[model samples]
Structures are given as structure tokens and as C-alpha cells.
Target chain A: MYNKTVSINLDSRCNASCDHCCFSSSPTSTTRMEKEYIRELVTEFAKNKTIQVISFTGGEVFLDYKFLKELMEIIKPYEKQITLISNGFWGLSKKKVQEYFHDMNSLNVIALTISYDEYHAPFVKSSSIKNILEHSRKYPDIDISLNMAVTKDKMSNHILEELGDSILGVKITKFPMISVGAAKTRIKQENIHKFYSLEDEDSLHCPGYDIVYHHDGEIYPCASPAIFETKITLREEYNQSFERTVEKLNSNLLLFILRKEGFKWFLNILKENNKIEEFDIPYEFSSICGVCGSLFNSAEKINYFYPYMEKYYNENF
Target chain B: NLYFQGHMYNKTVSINLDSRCNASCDHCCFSSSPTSTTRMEKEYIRELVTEFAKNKTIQVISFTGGEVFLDYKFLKELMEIIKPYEKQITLISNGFWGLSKKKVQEYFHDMNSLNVIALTISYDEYHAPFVKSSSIKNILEHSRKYPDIDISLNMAVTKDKMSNHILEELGDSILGVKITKFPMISVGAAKTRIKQENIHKFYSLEDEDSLHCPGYDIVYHHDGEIYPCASPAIFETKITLREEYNQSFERTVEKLNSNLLLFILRKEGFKWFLNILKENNKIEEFDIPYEFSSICGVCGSLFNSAEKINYFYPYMEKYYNEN
Candidate 1:
């Protein structure tokens, strides 16, 4: 279907050289979106009850002060399901996290996912997550979550279990490597196969729920390689008119987008080539692709072949 | 000709006939060289059969070789020797020798005397090129003539032979065919035909999901040597013929058949952590193994051979012509 997700790149720039950032955002990226465009998207999202959640993410969301404030303010009124995914580099500090919590309390956010690990952890340690968890533990009303991108060396169930136990009001996710960012440029040249255990059952089939917003305003079904693959431009194709887009977004048009179009296209290629016989896309896209997009290459296989995607879209979406 | 000792379903003694085969296929592992006469003495086999009768592990005795009828006298003697034990006797033959018109009536009489319950024949393109279809038809006619015996056709699958044409042919002419992958070994004719690149394509356990083939069976020998499976030799002293059926069998069964080793190595610290997580009401722990990738569509383990009940006997019934 025409599943719509908007990526508001708060700072089209990042200071950390993460090994697997999907967007590959660097200090060099000059791209910037106006506050008006974000506000308009929020209004459109509020009007479409089918749009269940509005998520805010970036190279470092905290770096874009003015844009974050304006975007949060606009999304505050429609409060139901709002999420802010952050690297926890800046927000890890007690003072900064308290300030943001007090400022954004009007939104009644469903969850705040703190992205942590080696790439982002070196910049802000687990203390960052611990600091936030300690502060949020006081406010039992707020929900907190931890998102950890697991590499070949770091896929310890023990670490993830401990992190999940320590973090209050939190959910722990061990994200698989997606083979993008610094991993592509560096790991591909040396230990590409080392990072992958072809023998692992979980690695062969992936559940893809990641999203990508192209420069030409296209919304790709999965996030891994939208720059090279075919994508549907919502602004030009489906969302030509906001009112019509909202109406059709919740109809069979979206189902057609997934079943007959976007995800279906990739699965068809795999089936034709006899690589795989069945496929299902992932339902949760908020976790790993942004960080682990470097170790894995089957973007199409993971996102579209997962059975969970169909289940989530059918029952919830 | 190295016979791997083992048992099937505990009550059955599976004897790997060390007799050299007539069909010198490209990759045969268990056959002796054409000129070699390394057959076990008939008297030795008779003594073994007597011991099997007294041993608690064996209730049925099955004979498999290059061709059971190749040494017709030896076959008849082996069967007669075990007859006093009143254990069910079975034989595996290629059927080519038995297909001749002159030999058919004689072989039928020999089979009747032995009171054999099951006879299995091999069929496939690999063996098909060497075996004429007309010969198969003759064997089927004999199988039909003796409707009291159990018969089965065992088909071995190789890379180039798993086509719909072959399956349909098998369905029409035989009772049933077992679908099995080629074994991994570094001996005999098979060594000349097998290559390294094909190892990953044929044998590597990359995508398996469930693991079977442990426990639920026992095998004891006249010499008191025990085997853990239907194939493969017993690890020295690891499996005892008589150990009071302790927890050792259970431990070995879980480790070898569960297909958890590969994933445990890759996940490294994950299992211990998962145990802790499970204890604390975290998401339940799952032991996902890398070998599970190889047999993902079936039972999660590359080597797991456990099948639904009555899996092997239907084919046995067809070969023997019994219900």
C-alpha cells in the first residue's frame, strides 16, 4: 500500500563518523528543510487519522535547535503517537534531557527511543542512557526505550538483556547490520564476509520496515538504497493533492502500493531469479537500518520477505 | 568396504553389507575395488546373528550391500543362520541380477525360504544410466508375484537429478522413494566425482530451523558395540552398548541433533545472557543456530532425519508386497 512516512532531517549534517548510518550524513551535507514544510506535513498527518505516528529523527536531532522546537510545537496538538529518535549524544546529559522533557511535555509522547552503541557510544556512553533512565524513572508517566544496533562483534544477548533490565519503561532492540555508511566504504574493502555469518538463520531472511525520503521527494518502501533503486514520489504520484492523498492513503491504494508496487517489485526480482520463493516486509522500521546498514546487503529480502510486515499492516495499519 | 555400525528405531539392526557392488558408479563410498574380495566370512556372520538374537538391542536384522544377490549362497546362509533367532530379516538389492528370467524363479524360492519381510531397490538417473528400466519392471513383477513381502524403492538425489520427470517416473514404477542429499565423505569413487565448490552447495548447513534425530532408538551388537544413529560409525567408547540407559544419551542427543552449535559459536555470549533475560521476565530467550539456515524450510537441522511416524515402513511394504 501507499504507506506514508516523512523524514524531517533536523541537521542534514553529523559530526560522528558512524560505521553504518544509512543516510550517510556527514558534516559536509548542506541540505536543510524549512520549518514551514515540517509544519505543513504535521498538519497533513493530523488530518489523516490513518497516519498513526509522527517520528522525528536526524544526523543529530538535538543540533537543530530552532527546527526541533518548531516541529515539536506543530505536532504537540495532535498528541496521540509522537516519537523522537535521537543518538543520545546531547540528550544524555541530565540538564539537557530535563530541559527537553519539560519543554515537550505538551505532546504527551508515546515513546522516546535513545539510539546507543559503539558508533554513537564513543561520543556518548551508556551513562547517557543511564542518565536519561534515572531521570525518567521519576516520571513514571513517560515511556523510554533503547535502540541498539548490533554488529558482528557486539550481538551479545547478555548486553542487550542487561540494558533492557536497567532502563526503566524501556524496550530493547538488537538491530542487524544494514551495510551502509562507513561500513560500506571501509568494511566492504576488508571484512565484508567477516561481519556476516551466512550460516546464521536470522541473517538470511530480514524483516524490512525501514523508510527513506529521497531528495526528489520520493518515499521509498525501505531505506537501504533509495538513491539507486526505483521509488514512488508521493508528492508527484500519490500525494498530488493533500485531501485526496489522505483519503486514498487509508484505502486500497496503499495496499496496492505495497502488494503490487514498491515492495512487490523487489520481491518479484528475487522470485524470478529464484533467490527466494516467499517474502514479507518488516513492520518496525525505527530500529536498525540507520546504523547497521553496512554489514547486510539484502535490503529487499529483509524488508519485503518478513511475514510480520503483512501482519502489522493488515491488523494495525 | 568400511561398514559403519548402527541401528534404526532401536529394535532393528541395520547391517551394512561389506560386499563389493556391481555398479561402479562415479562416487561410490562403501564399495570395495572391483578386484577386492574383502567379504566377511559366512561363519562369522552366522555367529554374529546368533549373538544378535541374545542381545537386547536388535529385534530385526537388515542386510545391505553392493548387491545382496551377488553372493546368492552367502545371502541364503546369512538368512538361514538368523532364522533360528526368528528376527525379521530384510535385504537390499539392485534388482538387476534378480531380473533375469532364469534367475527369477530360483531367487523367488530362495526369498521364500529366508522368509524376508522387506527388500529395497535403488532408482535414479545416477544409477538409472547403468540400470535399464526393463530390469526394474521385471523386479516389480516379482514383487507383485510375492504379495506377502514388504518392498520399497530408495532414491538417492544428487545435484543434477531432482526433476519432476524423475519423481513422476518413481511414483509410477515403485512404491515410494526417499529424498535425501548426497553424503559428505572422503573415500572411494565418490571422492573422484565430488569437488570443493560443491561442498557448500551440497553439504554446508546454512539455513536450518528445527533439529530432530536424537533419542528414541537403541542398537546393540553381538560384540556389545553400540551405535547412536542409522549412519556413521560409533565414536570410540563415547557410546556404550550397556550403560543402564542414563542421561548421557539425552545429553548427546540434544547436542548433536539440536543444531545449536553453530549459532552458539556465532552468538558467543548470547545464550548465557538469554538465560538471564528469560529469568527476569524479559523477552523469552531463543537459541538460534547458524546451521538452522541449511534446513530452515524443513526441520532446522541439516542432518536431522526424524520423519513423521510410519515414514519408512510404507516403502518397505511396497518392496515386500505386503500391506
Candidate 2:
């Protein structure tokens, strides 16, 4: 009855509008969380002392430099492993990356996991990985890893080389449907020409690990479905208010308010409510069910599901 | 690159199929040393399958034996037990027993009904010396009779004198004959029969060059262990078989971002490194030389033993000429 991890979005904003940014984060999304709330969460983390890791996500975590610095200051005392999942945008600036690198190095953050995709390249440009490489070279103590979302499209051999050696490490995760604002409409547009069956497609339906926090102080089971799913209000006061405004969601409650609810069933309730379309998956990024994508999606089905997917057959297939 | 091959990753359950074989071939591995046990209890196989089915990763279950047909009923129940996962199934048999006229019809009928992918039958002079050629002919006739069931004829090359020529001839004409070299295995029938003299010749440079097992395919299932290659299991206890029921797949892939590197290291003597990481608590200046990188002496012998093959050619030529 224990949730392994929880996601705290420091800022409900991102620098990019990637099709698969499931949190529906955008440069203009005002659903930003207060820095104090994040600090309180970190304090609560220290109080619990059992949670293994804390992930800091954002519209782009690096976008709000002040928030990151303040948040880091709060969590720096309690020596828990910190993971920053980003689109590699903030590091594009040498000065900003260097400053952040110094803070992380001092904190001894175990890993700096960066997400690399074509969409983020627009904001950070292709030079983002190069910048990370350059920064890691300067600060060798900082362990670096790149999270490359393997989509249906063919990735260049150079990218493969970059993935293997240029970065200290790479995690080849299948792209999940990250729905960010207008990207949802783009998904609908692309679905006209490209369509697929769920059984036939590779599904990356891993809901156990990911959690998303809304600016309104709502916690989502996973960030992958946050764009369409309501955040589970942990506070009873907020829950009463949300319940009053919205029809009380179909409840399959257990005796203990915190213990009995199944997290998987909770996420399924979001999908079942038509808040998120089952087939209305994002095309620019990876669809969520592709655990590794190759495991679930067929080659034909992947092509049919994603419109402009970069091919990554030689690396994986 | 079979569809279900990768699906066995961290998944799939393997049944021992019992350690019993009819022909005690000289080069036989698996210590096919000699055993009288029939199939494991049918209930055991059933329970193991059901237990493993609970794990989402496992989707395929395989049953292999020194010769599985020693207890055909166990195999039938086993097939029935595993039929629920019906993704990909492979039955490894010597063919002599399983392909018998009595079992052939039933096997074909069951295999067809179960959608079995293949029934691999080992073929060679060593196995053939004890098993009648009539069995191969009957199996082939059976294959013709039920064209639906897939049959892959396997031949083991252990004795240079008899097998090399046989393989060379068969490789040219036979359509489905798969030539598996005499595995440098440690236990069972191989230990008693294989002499250093034979070993030296069987693993000669010419033989190694001509015989490339790729060390990629050919998963071995014995008792409860699964290995990437049958030969390596003879020496090491590393289980490379499916860990789960759902198939997990992988090809030779190199990831730079990942700490675990799998590939050939030129400095490490062109030896393949399946898992390589920096030595902990060791500084770059004081670290040991690359020669120390070689682990698993069996793997080294299997790959580099070919270097000593030249020393045995004269003896082999003499043995071949005399034979």
C-alpha cells in the first residue's frame, strides 16, 4: 500500500511545446506551484526519510532558474538522491548550465537525467547535448545521463554515436504520449491519416512509476496522462472543494483513505471517464504504452500511431 | 530474429525435460553422462508453469530433455499445461524417440493443434550410428505427411574425421540441416570420450574459421538452467535462458550512455565484453592491465582455443587417412 515515488512540478511551465509533454505544460501555462510548496514537500520528504528519490520536473525545470535554486537550497540539507528530468533547454546557456552544474556538484546529486528529443531541440537547439557534454567534461564529478525517447522514425547513426559515447550514459525509453496544450490538436489532425489498433501497437503503459503534480496542488498518478486526468487532491480541504465543483468521481474506496485505493485503478478511472482519449495519443512524441516501444508496438503499428516518428530500428530492432 | 525470441526477456519458464538420452555419443554434452529419470512430475511442470505465469514477463515456456519422449505423457501434459500462453513454443528432441511412428502421429497432431513453432531433431553420424537412418527417413516422411509442423534437422560436428565431411556434404545439399559444432562442454558423455588430442583437433583454426556458431543463438536448456549457447553452459553456470514467460529480446546493441558496455574490446585482446565497468576503489594510474579484464576462463577457451587447432592437424590428417 506504499507509493514508491511522487512527482512535484516546481513550475507548471515548459520552454517547449513537444507533442508528448503529457503534463500539457507550455511556456505560458500559469499552473505554476509556489516555491514554498516545493520546499514543504522536500521537508516532508526529509521527515519521511524512506522515499528513495525525488524527481524535479517543470514546463522545463531549468526555465525557472530562481525556483530551482531556491528548491535546491531546501533539499540540499537532506542527502537524498535527486533526479532532474528535463528537455535539456536550460543547459543551452553556458552560464546557466555552469551555475546549475556547480550547485548539483556541491549537492552530490547522484544523476542528472536529461531528456533529448527533436521537439526540445527547437528551444535548446541540437547543441544542447554538446553543451551537456562540454559541461560534464568540466565537472566530471557530476554523473550525466541522457534519456532518449526512441520513436517510430529512423534515428541517425550520429545520434546513436552521441547516445553511446558523447553522453556519459543514455536511457533509451520508449516515448510516451506527452500531451502539452495544442499538441493534442496536432494528434487529432495526424490521426486522420495514421490510425492503429491497441493490440497491434506497442504500448508503453507503465503507470506504476510516474506521478504528476498540477499547479492547483493536484497529484496525478503519472505525468503521461496528466494532460487529461485530474490531479488527486491529497488535502481533504481541496478534495471537498474539487468534489463540490466537479461530480464526485466514481469512487472505489478502501477503509483507510490513504491505503486502500489502487493507484492503477485510480489512473484507469481517469481514462475511463473520457478525460483522455484512448486513441487520441500524441504523435510527435512516443505513445505511453510502448514500455520500450519495441516490446509492445509492431513496426507497422508504430508507423500508423505516430505521424513524424524518427526511425530507431537499427539501434533497437 | 524470431518474433518471440526477444519476448523471452526476463520472462519465460524453462522445464528440464528430464536428464535422459538414448545414444551415448562421444561428443555428447549435458553430461548426457547417463540418467534413468523420466520427465519431472507432471504436477511439478504444471505448478512451475502456473507459478511462472504469474510473472507478466514470461510468455513462452520450453521443455527440453536428454530426450523428452522418454515420458511422452509428461510432455503431453506439459504441452497442455503451457498451451495457455501459446505465443511461441519450441521442443528440442533427438528425433529418434519423438519421431517414432507411434509418437510421430500424436506429436504432429498435438503440435498442429498447439501451433508449435518447431520440433528440432538432432542429426549426425554419432547419433545416427545408434539411431537408424530409417528414423530420419520416417521423420522426413512424417514431415511430408504433415507439412504444417516445422522441422529443423540439427547435426552435431564433434569428430573431425566423420563429421567434417558429413557436414560439408550436408551443408551443400540438405535444405534444413543445421550444423552445430561439437560444443566444448565439460560434463556428462563428453568428459569420458573427448581426449585432449581430439579436443585439439576438433577446435582447430580451420575448423573454427569454418565453424562459426555465432555464439549468439542456440539457447541451451538443461534441468532448470538456460544458457545463451550450449557450449558455454558446459563450463559456466550462467543461466541465459528466459527469466520470464513473456519473451525478452535483444540483439548485439551497444549503448554509450549506459554504464554496462557489451562489445569486443581490442585492447582486451579482441575479446567480447558482455558486462564491463570500471574497477571500484581503483585509480586510473594504479589500475591493473587490460589482460586482467578477461573473466570466465571457459569463454576465453571457447573463443581462443581455436589458436591451438593447428598443432592437431597432422594428427587429424593421419586419423582421417587411417579411418
Candidate 3:
């Protein structure tokens, strides 16, 4: 079940510590995944018949440039399955930009998702974004897209023009600000917009369909609040380390329901148990990750729902 | 800016020989199966060929359908008519006939008798269940005998290629042929392939032949109607090929060439049309992602929507007239 794609956070260190960063990655935070462990995980991901895609990210993946290239060397055989995410910082210089794409071409990594928005703008240069978009035309086969967070306004239209003509054909993934790290405590609640209607909100469901491995030797069900909390520490190597870890994840009643049934069933379960008010989910947040933090943030609430979650999973699983 | 040559608009005239197919593949735009009886009549085809040969404007004459080889007798007869023309004949099929090497030989022999320069075999996950791997191998190996004919495999790729990995599942015996992978558009029998969440999520920037109108030329259907493109049909071209010989045929060509909408699209491609739509503020109504399936898919959406045409027609007319 913990198969499809594995998003590996190679490092916790980032160039910019934005007010709403999900990982709270900064220059001061310098935790990088051990290269030896990455190799082990890559081999497991490759050998495991079920896993298809291996997603790579970091403080800025390019910041740890040599290590990323080394990671590519190990993952070169499965280039089609490899997808890289970046802050677009290395794109400022054309010479380095060539090296960056040269690395991508070597690995046959065809898709790059750049995290761009107003919050990310201060750290990354406009020239850098332009340069990245410019180089994108050379490798026409490589797909380019933006992972942008929206408030009242969408950054897509603004950045579409700001980045110029090359950016026109690029796909943009617009998402609400996920309150995980910096946004949880620092960013104002009023800023995150409720763009969807009540009907739209009511019908929404989250398919927590990923296994994210953070730099600090932790496995998360997803990249939402589950990244900061609800993550299990990696156990020492056994014969079937990854499989054993997944079994534990699947056993957790709250996490298992969250993974399999998504927000629809979870919200329904909350209504069943009459424990829906503490989050005030409807009044406060538009994003499901909003509920993720509120519900999964504390162990006390998790303890309260343990028996109920187990009972529900007993019938469903 | 003012005019394009009639030849530019008539680069390739694709004729559908028949609509009956051996396999009802899920992602098939036509949703064709053995049950379909629609076919282009031999007399109508002969007359169409007469006009095409005389005009000398059409560069290549392509034959496709449910499976072009379904009606072996009709195909050879049409090839005989096309034999006199000496134009480039392109044949598209699913290689089901490749089940027998003798059948494969007879098929290519007839194609070579005319001028069938290209042979495209539709082999992928959808068709894999219907066609044996050995059949594909036979087709690939036999095609090596035809030095003149260029053979290629076209795969309609789905999201989960790893699970159903067609090439791998088929084994290494059929790996040498050139394969072109295209997106599986949700239409006809393939509607269930794309789930609700992934409706407009396809983003292949370069995958989209954006700058040009694919339907600039004519696609003559099995049912005697003229269209720009389809079976995953785009464009609502309703010019029924009249039995009045070259009379209506030339008019059809002239009409399509003179169309302002087709003119701009063929000239500047989809980006030019999309920008105009962007200016008009109805671009969002289409809910098109940055990368769509192809130029045909997006262009089809524009022409099919009455409300969109209502906005575009006047805008394009003025945009053309002013230029």
C-alpha cells in the first residue's frame, strides 16, 4: 500500500525560511539525509515492484548540488520514475543552468516542479525564474510546472506573465497554504483564503496516497501535518525494513483511516464521535491539511479516537 | 497574412475506408468494433480519387478506419484506383491480420502494388489484450521486407503504464519497432479510463502540437461526410461529399482555405488562438490546463462550444479583416 511514489526530503536546510514554509527549512537548519541511507532506500524503491515514482526535494535540491548529482547516479537506471522539485535558485546563472539540465538529461529526469509564489519571491530572484523558464525551451521534452500556494489571489496569472513567454505553456498547480511548519505559528490565519464554496468544500476528499521520507530519518504518510507530526522514526535495518515500517503505519487506526478513506470518512467519524468542534475546521480553514494539524497535532485526541478508529477499521479493512 | 495557398490547406487527405474493427479498444476515439457496418463506398472513393489526382494539391493520400485491413477486397480495389494517382498512400491498422504470415505477405503485397509508403500499427495496453504478441512480431519482422514502407507503433499511454506496462508484458520479442506514445483522450469507449480527479490534469507542453491547426486539411469519414479531424473527432465539418464529382470537392477545399478561424490557427498555431481567448476572458470556461492532450483536443473544445464560438467568430473575423 505504501508504494506508488516516494517523496524523499533530502535535506531540511533551505536558502529561504519563508513565513509559511511547510518544512520550516532555513540556512540554520542543516540536517541532510545520509547518502548511505539514501542509497539503501533507492535500492528498496527500485527492487520493490509496486513503487513507480521517486520524487526528490531538499531545502533547495540544488543547494546540495553534488549530493543530488550523486543521487542521480544511483537513480540513473530508473530515470523515467525520477521527478525533481526545486526552489529555482540555481537557475540564476546560465552556465550552472546548463550543468543542472545536463545532470537531468544524464538521469533522463523529464519533469521538474518549481515551488514559486509571493512568499518564495524574496529568496529567489526574478532573473533566476526567467533564466529557468528560458532554459526550459531548450529541453522541450522536459515538463515544467509551478507548485504555488494561493490566498485571495492566485499567483499563477501573475507569475505566468512575470516569468515571460516561456512560462506560458507551463502547467501550474495552485494549492491553498498548508499550515504545517512556519504557517502553523507565524503566518496569519486570515491570509489563507477559502476559495471553494460550501458545496465544493463538502464534496472534497483527500487521498493521502504517498509515503514521504524526511531527511531526519522519519517516515510520513504524506507531506501535510503528517510530516511534522504523526511520523514514525526509522527502525534499524532488518531483512524487510521498508515493509515492516509500512505494516506499522497500516496498523495505526487514525493514520490508516486517514490514508485509505481520506477526509470524507474521517470527518464523518468525527461527526459520529461528536469530536468535530475543537478544530472549528469549517470556520477556520479551506485546506484539508488544516484539519490534519488540528486532529493529528496532539496525542490526547489521538488517544481518545483510538478505540473508535480501531472499531471502524475492523469492519472496513 | 492575407491568403494561404490551397495546397497548404490540403497537405494530406485522409480517407476512412471502413468503420468495422476487429477489436473494440477502450481508448478508441471511434469506439468501433466488428459490429460497425459504416464504410466508404468504392464508387464514392473512385470519384474522390479522380478529383484528388487532377488537383495535384494533396501531397499524401492516407487510409485509416475501424481497421483499414478489415475489408481486404475494398482496400485492394481502392489501392488500384489510387495506383493510377501515384500519390503517397499511408495505411493504418491494428496488425490483427499479422496472425498469419501468409496474410501479412498478401497485405503488404497489395499495399506495395499501390504507393503505401507508411504502415502504422496501433499496439499498446488497450489493443494488447486483443492482439497476440506473436502477431505484432510477425508484422514487425515482415515489414522489414518492405524497404519503401516506414513502419511505426503508436501506443495510447495511460497514467499507470507501470502496472499494465505493455512493452514489458509483451516480452522482448517485439521491442525493435519504432514506438510513438500518445495520451489516451477520454472519449467514446475510453471515458472510464480517466477518473474524475484527473480530468484536465494532462500537461505535455511539447506533446501538444500547439502552433498549428491539425484539421487544416480534410479527413473524409467512412460515412461520406467531410471533417477537419476526428474519430476522437474535433471540428464540426459537415460538407457531405457530393456525387457531383470534382464540383463540390473543389468548393469544399476553397471554403476551408478561406475560413478565417482555420487560417489564423494554421498560421500561428494554438498559442495564438489561446491568447485571443485569454484576451476575451472566456479562456477559463474551457478549464484547459497549460498542457492539454493535443492541438486537436483543445481546438475541438473551441469549435464544439456554441458560446465559445459566439465569442470567437466575431473576434477572429475582425482580427482577420484588420490584418
Give candidates' CA RMSD values in order: 23.6, 18.7, 21.6
Give me the runs in candidate 1 sitting further than 4 Å from their true place.
A1-7, A47-50, A154-169, A188-216, A222-232, A237-317, B1-323
Which stretches of model 2 miss by more than 4 angstroms?
A23-26, A93-102, A105-108, A131-145, A148-164, A167-169, A176-180, A187-206, A209-211, A226-235, A238-317, B1-323
Model 3 per-residue lDDT tens digits across residues B1-323: 89874334566788787778989887776778999887767787777776776666676888888887877887777778667768788888899998988998888888877888998888877787788878987887676456578777776655454113454444322323444555555566766655534433334434433235534457777766676554363523222333333455567776666667667766766666677767767666766545555445566565665666566677687887789
lDDT of 2 by residue, B59-155 (tens): 5556676777666786677677666766556677777753468877777778777756667777676676667666665665455334445666555
Report the lDDT tens digits of candidate 1 across residue range B114-158.
Answer: 778777766655566666766765675566456456665554434
Give per-residue CA lDDT, model 1, range A58-83, as digits (tens). Answer: 67777766767776766667664666
DockQ list for all candidates: 0.01, 0.01, 0.01
TM-score of 2: 0.40
Docking quality tier of candidate 3?
incorrect
Query: How does model 3 score on DockQ?
Result: 0.01
Error of 1 at B170 (Å): 45
Rank list by lDDT = 3, 1, 2
Regions of candidate 3 where Cα sits further than 4 Å from its true position: A78-80, A153-158, A195-204, A225-227, A231-240, A246-252, A259-265, A268-274, A277-282, A313-317, B1-323
lDDT of each: 0.49, 0.47, 0.67
| Clashes by residue pair, model 3 | B210-B270, B211-B269, B212-B269, B230-B233
lDDT of 3 by residue, A277-300 (tens): 863445455555566666656666
